[PDB]
Design a protein around this ligand. Structure first.
Ligand SMILES: [Fe+3]
Ligand SMILES: [Fe+3]
Lengths: 168, 168
């Protein structure tokens, strides 16, 4: 399906407060889609940003395996504890206000946890002709972004997600 | 329905070149949606831009009845001459690249004639769960923007439309 829900039973307000505090210490980089790497390669010199990527040439996700040590004492670490899979290359992916993607296909689908969002932030699947909203309800949403699609944020606040990859 | 096509027989390339020419003497204003008024109120002192003001400043489109004089001998004037309705508050409306607006309802539905566009420009109707593309094919597309909708331009270029109002 385009989308599936896995209940993690995370508290959305506590997850938000946790993510807000993290970003004060480790700000998002880039513009348009702003990013923070939550997993790093073993013994990485730049653990918080190396996994962040947005160039047209995608690198492999497989070696970004280590949840950063300082998440362990945070509610955000509890999200990683509850995951039904081992994540790889987990990032905070924040869509800027008034910003959207090209209609395109991704190589790999990902799991989205909406941290902050609004009714103005949607995925748009062009062939399926469906519009999809990921609520900040503390649950995990598989989204099949191999389907031709865009995502947009029509609001005035950033739409902050946590976006997990997986191999298996 | 949300949309309808009236075949107007406009030549897309003359339209485009006629618009690009106009804009070199009368630039778009504003940032997210960039605009130029093609009709003005009688005796307006700022005819090219008064019709572009935000809604809280405009009682209704009806006053904006006058196609500028300098258009009347261009291809654009010929577009005006082919409408099946009398138009009001006609504007050039251009979405910036990678830009989208909020999910909202317009006071008034309008007719779109696309000048330059790409597959990354779409209208999204949230309640009808439809995604719609308006092609630069020379034809007039009515779009019921009273329905809860957004639009987005995920491309690298501006998406230029001509947007016409009417009274009947
Ligand atoms: Fe825990
Ligand atoms: Fe549909």
């Amino acid at each position: 399906a385009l989308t599936s829900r896995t209940e993690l039973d995370i508290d959305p307000d506590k997850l938000r407060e946790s993510v807000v505090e993290l970003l004060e210490r480790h700000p998002l980089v880039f513009e348009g889609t702003r990013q923070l790497a939550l997993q790093h390669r073993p013994e990485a010199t730049d653990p918080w940003y190396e996994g962040c990527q947005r160039q047209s040439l995608i690198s492999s996700d497989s070696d970004f395996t280590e949840v950063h040590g300082e998440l362990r004492d945070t509610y955000l670490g509890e999200v990683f504890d509850r995951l039904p899979f081992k994540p790889i290359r987990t990032r905070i992916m924040a869509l800027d206000p008034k910003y959207c993607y090209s209609v395109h296909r991704d190589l790999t689908p990902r799991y989205h946890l909406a941290v902050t969002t609004s009714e103005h932030a949607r995925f748009v699947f062009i062939e399926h002709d469906k519009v999809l909203h990921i609520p900040a309800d503390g649950d995990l949403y598989y989204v099949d972004t191999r389907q031709l699609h865009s995502a947009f944020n029509g609001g005035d606040d950033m739409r902050i997600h946590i976006v997990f990859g997986t191999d298996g």
